[PDB]
Amino acid sequence: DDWEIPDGQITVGQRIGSGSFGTVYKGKWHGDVAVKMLNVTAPTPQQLQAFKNEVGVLRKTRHVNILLFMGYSTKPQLAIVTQWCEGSSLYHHLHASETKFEMKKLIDIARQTARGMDYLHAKSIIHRDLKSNNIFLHEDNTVKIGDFGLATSILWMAPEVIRMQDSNPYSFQSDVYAFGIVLYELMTGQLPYSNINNRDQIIEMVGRGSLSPDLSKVRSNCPKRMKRLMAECLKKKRDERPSFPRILAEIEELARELS
């Protein structure tokens, strides 16, 4: 198929965010859209990568819970087009807002995210950055996964990742682990290592093995099966971690019960 969008078809609204590299504007192409472009007059060889690659990956995703890739463009300046969604990042709702979700919502958020994550993995895609920021809540309703990071974090890094190891640290497994924190986030409602201020502490302490999320923090309501599953992904050793098919399957089963 062909996803290249003819030059000058798109129309760029107000800046929605900026990464140096990358900036996203609210656009208009056959309806609302979001576009990320490198305003740098001429594309560097670096950039020409972040473009090539990111379209490489997005092309291969059609799913309700993956943010919708629409098309790309080169000439005026390199650009990537996606659907425009109203809502705020999960990180936002959780840590950035008074917002209280019924456990049902919380559970479902998790269900949807796992549906999303299972899809990628099946398609042999490693997110490499999962986290509550990169989980988007559309219409405040449904979950859209993507990489909103404009700079390319620590709390979600699995240990073998924090330790440089064999430099091929990222795997479906690390992803399972990042997923595990997201659950920690959903069930407790707090980020991990809360009472720990120096951010340098966590980096050594977590990778050495001395530290993992203090689960007493998960609130009272969280189903046992859930807290288990959490603890499961957070299992320090890569092969200790469940695979997303196991996870979704679990998670669908928890919900049928709370129904």
Ligand SMILES: Cc1ccc(-n2nc(C(C)(C)C)cc2NC(=O)Nc2ccc(OCCN3CCOCC3)c3ccccc23)cc1
């Ligand atoms: C280098 C690189 C390589 C791969 C990726 N890639 N990988 C993924 C996976 C893991 C989900 C497959 C996703 C990412 N890419 C992204 O998540 N990309 C983007 C996210 C958010 C954006 O707009 C966000 C703001 N939002 C848009 C909707 O309306 C509300 C505001 C985007 C706007 C325009 C273009 C890309 C966007 C990314 C970068």
